[PDB]
Design a protein around this ligand. Sequence first.
Ligand SMILES: N[C@@H](CCCC[NH3+])C(=O)O
Ligand SMILES: N[C@@H](CCCC[NH3+])C(=O)O
Lengths: 484, 484
Amino acid sequence: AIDFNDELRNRREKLAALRQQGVAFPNDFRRDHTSDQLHEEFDAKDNQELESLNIEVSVAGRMMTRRIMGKASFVTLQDVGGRIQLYVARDSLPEGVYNDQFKKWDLGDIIGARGTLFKTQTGELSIHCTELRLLTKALRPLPDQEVRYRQRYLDLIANDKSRQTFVVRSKILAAIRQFMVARGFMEVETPMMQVIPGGASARPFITHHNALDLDMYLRIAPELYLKRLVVGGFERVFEINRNFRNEGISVHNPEFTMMELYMAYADYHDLIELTESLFRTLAQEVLGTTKVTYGEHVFDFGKPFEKLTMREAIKKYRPETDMADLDNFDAAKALAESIGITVEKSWGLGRIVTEIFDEVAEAHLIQPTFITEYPAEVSPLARRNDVNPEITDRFEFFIGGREIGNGFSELNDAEDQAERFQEQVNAKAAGDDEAMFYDEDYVTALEYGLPPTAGLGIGIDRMIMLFTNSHTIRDVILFPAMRP
Amino acid sequence: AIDFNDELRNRREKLAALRQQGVAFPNDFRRDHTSDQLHEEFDAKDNQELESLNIEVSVAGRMMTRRIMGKASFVTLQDVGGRIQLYVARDSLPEGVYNDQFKKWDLGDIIGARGTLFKTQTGELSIHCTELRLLTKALRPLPDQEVRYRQRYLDLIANDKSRQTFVVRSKILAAIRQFMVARGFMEVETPMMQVIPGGASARPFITHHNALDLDMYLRIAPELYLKRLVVGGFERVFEINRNFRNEGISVHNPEFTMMELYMAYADYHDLIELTESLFRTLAQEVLGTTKVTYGEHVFDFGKPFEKLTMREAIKKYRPETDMADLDNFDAAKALAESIGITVEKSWGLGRIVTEIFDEVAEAHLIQPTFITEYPAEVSPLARRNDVNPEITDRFEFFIGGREIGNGFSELNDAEDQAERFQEQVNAKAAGDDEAMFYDEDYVTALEYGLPPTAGLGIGIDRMIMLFTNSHTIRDVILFPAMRP
Ligand SMILES: N[C@@H](CCCC[NH3+])C(=O)O
Ligand SMILES: N[C@@H](CCCC[NH3+])C(=O)O
């Protein structure tokens, strides 16, 4: 209780002493090795080898543990690559350093060490220090469960598993890029600020551009811009970046990372194949196996995902459903309301059926699953099905009961797109706050001619969860949006 | 004039006919080669070789030119990789296709072709088509100078040089990532929406989070978050993404791409070296040479950048300056005002001197140049110089008379950081609308201990300009913010 306030006072006082001696915060020590490198190269060597090799190295990091035993001490130093042992002895260091400096430092302090590699009696790799310095005085001791999110730096210092999660996120993004580029896709950057938001249905964030006296929107999706690029001739493009949806912070984050990709002369079937390869590749290359453990489940990304139509999923998860009800507006509305769905005045049959699917099946799609036949009403940007114009060549895919991706054969029929935008404008007029805005320039782009194309959006944060056994999106986002 | 309205009517009518025949917009044709691949592999082969090799391929793209000559025609097809010639003959295609379909198509139409490779009498690589299809009817004919920005898709269809510019941008970003990762840097993602904006000085964009009834800011820089990651132990991190500054759209874009990188146990000198290697590497790997032509200049990224202190730059570009004036507030204010700078009440000597440097020297820094010794007043996040506390270990670097990067040894002195934040709060109270907000959590992070570190921000859009001979930032941003 009070012992903490003493740690603080003690560290301040030690800092005051440093200031009196000269420059309290230097920037001069240079390391030439991180712990992981030392382990990779030297863990397999016994003390006899290291003795003859006589390898001197320099490391730096946070002093995590210290056991002072008179004339000698043992320190665990934690850097970007993990931890390495330091053997700190009075007579190995320059005169006075051990007793007048080292012993006065505190756990949490950033230190630098140079010395010779060897192995302890316990067989651990260690550095027999010949030089040791205090680089940064830590004014605070080493560290609900919200603290992890409000002070992620404390989470990263303390928890090896949190660190590994974020290192894996970076490995996954790099591997996605490598996967995409190998398939001839080119990464592009489209606006975050848009005059007309689109490419999805969501309440947007609005901001005022002080200069051009205009109201701008943070993007809910880059879709309409990416398809303009395909019209332009960039027939294989992808973008990995944020979308912003003014929903709630219900562990949901207002901003999240999405990858969208478009490939001309392909349909949704090609996206299905690409999705399966991507997951199999990521699992194999990043995790070492195609069988991934997530909670109480195992996902085999080496086997094809399940494929069901939206109606098959509804029937499978609410077997008592009279499927004929989904063909009649009144019946579908009644069914929807009976399962707790508030049916808005603007909704049509296709929207109601989709909402029923969400309520009924989504949570149960645990194993990787593609759900096809999304109604036209809820897919204003998707190609109509040749046989039944009321459904589109669109799928969403789910893993662990969450939506991971959304893909479709793109609507390249400009006149149809205009009509569908108009319907969305009518829906907003009828109360649909999330309906799409009419985008004339986008229609114009389609009039110049969009090649037949397939596009896919994949929630990167959700994907990261599945590969790191995280069960809240907040565990894979470095700095989650936190309530004040 | 009226001939355009006829093109439109004609294309609509042809589309109407397509609709009557069946599905006007199919998604079925699959290609197996792009033009660039065909050229790479087959340009060096003469007609004798191609005749015996008898290689059949499938391509698809926009019909750019067509010369109909009775029973045979020549078409230029433009895809993602460039252009390839098609030889379209009545008797080579299935019955009726040539006369009843092909001849009725229009330039701009997206078409698919399968056929055998050969070389024309002119020595050009061409495809003797055996199958040809209309994939997408173009309802509009092929395309101030603002149109390029308002309809970038038209710019990309029409101008090979615009395309190449954006292909190079993507190559540069990929090469930057490859350069960074090779040096042990890990790419991370920090928030675009922040409760407290910081890491730079600029008027921000504000947006309301409908849910959490809170006002949020689009980030002006990710700096404060990235340094929290270094405290956390991610000692080599970088982020490449947008910043948003509510300035003007004076060809300046409200949102732009920046790379920020941080490396612990390094100072600004290491950033200088990294900057030089990065540019030399990018030029060599992407452009094929270290000597880069930009406008009327040539930049040799194979030779060290020039290095001048801020004062040396002022003296060099306004030689008549009595340098002693920069040591006296009144004198400096008078000097500043005499060159047209409006000196605000909140400004101190360091700010005035920096403003003088901007007015006097910035535009003249054509050859790659580092400018050191930035005053403390204008560098609230930078490490103080050991000898003179009123300047910081900070530099900015310029090329082509524009600021390309900003880097410094990081301030890891928590108590100093708090004081400097307080000064920034005072500056805002005194009228500085762009002054930094006090960030308590950031100070707390520094109290846990930030290793000595060097950080650098590089304007990616400006960098792209220098490598593509573009002279407005709008030429390297796919969809520039355009006035309504
Ligand atoms: N824009 C979609 C992803 C791409 C769908 C195919 N065009 C979304 O935000 O869900
Ligand atoms: N945050 C700086 C770049 C990094 C400077 C070094 N910490 C900027 O926006 O200019």
